[PDB]
Amino acid sequence: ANPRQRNKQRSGKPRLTRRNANKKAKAKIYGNFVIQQNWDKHATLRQNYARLGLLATPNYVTGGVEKLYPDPTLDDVLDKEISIAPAKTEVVRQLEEEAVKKAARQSNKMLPLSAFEHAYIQRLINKYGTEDFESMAKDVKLNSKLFNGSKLKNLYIRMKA
Template identity: 40%
Template sequence: MANPQQRQKQKSGKAKLTRKTAQQRKKVPIKGSEIIAANWDKKFTLKQNYARLGLVATPNPLSGGSEKLNPPKKLDVEKEKSKLKANEAIIERDEAGNVVNIIYGKAPLEDMDIEPVEAKTEVVKQLEEQASKAVKATRVVSENEEKWLQALVDKHGDDYEAMFRDRKLNTMQNSAGQIKRKIKVWRENGKKQKMVAA
């Protein structure tokens, strides 16, 4: 007979962790781009899916190795030399396992010229098309912010350092650069509103 504590565990809504439930937990929904979610294959890993879709999983090739499901037992050294990237190397060993030679890859990434690559897959083309249609969000200046900026300009003109040091008006302690950007947006919005009114 189960004691009260064990009985409470049985009633608990928390699922028991088994191999089956652990596998179900791993299934993560893909958030973000609908195009990638539609073309995603859950049988493959992240890097394999990205390679299949024509995308790059890690922008920096120097961080992290590449996945090899079935690495070849014997490497053709001459072929592999041409494939070596920056900061990669092949270690040649003799029959006893002693290191005979180390063949290093090409120059570091900074010295390499990166050529623009055309979209190879349909997914990449769809993503580029989606990115080209993206609308830039315009910042709207509120009435209170407009009054505050007007007071700063009336008092200090275009002296942003003085605006930054003004303790009474600059209560939120915005930096000189932040104030300058806000005033620029405010002035641009004012010009647009005048054009619409005309």
């Protein structure tokens, strides 16, 4: 009915038809592989999270939840340490073990020294022993970078292992 719509109604050039709209089709899971393998595409994300053992939200839900079956003092707690939480389902247990084995693999955070760092701290050690990190810091000739005692420690431990 527009001039621009009447233009292509009387045209011979076909309409740029695209077929993309299919309602009720929920977004497929990328991201986590373990969640993807255990996600059933029919269910809702609240149903999927609860089945997997995960919380969709850590806050209250703003409405009634579905019922399918007929269901059968600062200091003490500010100092207490909550003793983790149980892994109800297999998927949660799988995620927990995967995280722990990954953390164990990526656990050796300590680095060796380079050629310059080793020679730097070795020369400082050969004069002031291995305990007087305060005196090594105040040494102006050998500690030309003006490293403090805490950094001269971090070099010494990194050289040991």
